Amino acid sequence: XXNXXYX
Ligand SMILES: *[C@@H]1O[C@H](CO)[C@@H](O)[C@H](O)[C@H]1O[C@H]1C[C@](C)(N)[C@H](O)[C@H](C)O1
Ligand SMILES: [Cl-]
């Protein structure tokens, strides 16, 4: 991924 979250 690379982005983060949290969803
Ligand atoms: C998400 O990124 C932050 C900042 O770099 C780290 O401090 C954190 O430890 C990291 O969270 C981990 C734990 C989690 C949420 N279970 C996932 O595995 C993520 C990808 O990594
Ligand atoms: Cl991500």
Can you tell me the distance from the alpha carbon of 2 to that of 5, in angstroms, rounded to the nearest whole number?
A: 10
* Number of the ligand closest to the Cα of 1: 2
Experimental method: electron diffraction
Distance from the alpha carbon of residue 4 to the mean position of ligand 1, in angstroms: 8
* Number of the ligand closest to the Cα of 6: 1
* Number of the ligand closest to the Cα of 2: 2
Tokens representing 5?
A: 């979250």
Tokens representing 1?
A: 């991924």
The torsion angles phi and psi of 3, rounded to 5 degrees, stand at: -105, -55
Q: Write b or e for each residue in 1-7: b if 16 or more Cβ atoms lie within 10 A of its Cβ, otherwise e.
A: eeeeeee
Distance from the alpha carbon of residue 6 to the mean position of ligand 1, in angstroms: 9
Cα 4 vs. chain centroid, distance in angstroms? 2
Q: What is the resolution of this structure in A?
A: 1.2
Distance from the alpha carbon of residue 1 to the mean position of ligand 2, in angstroms: 4
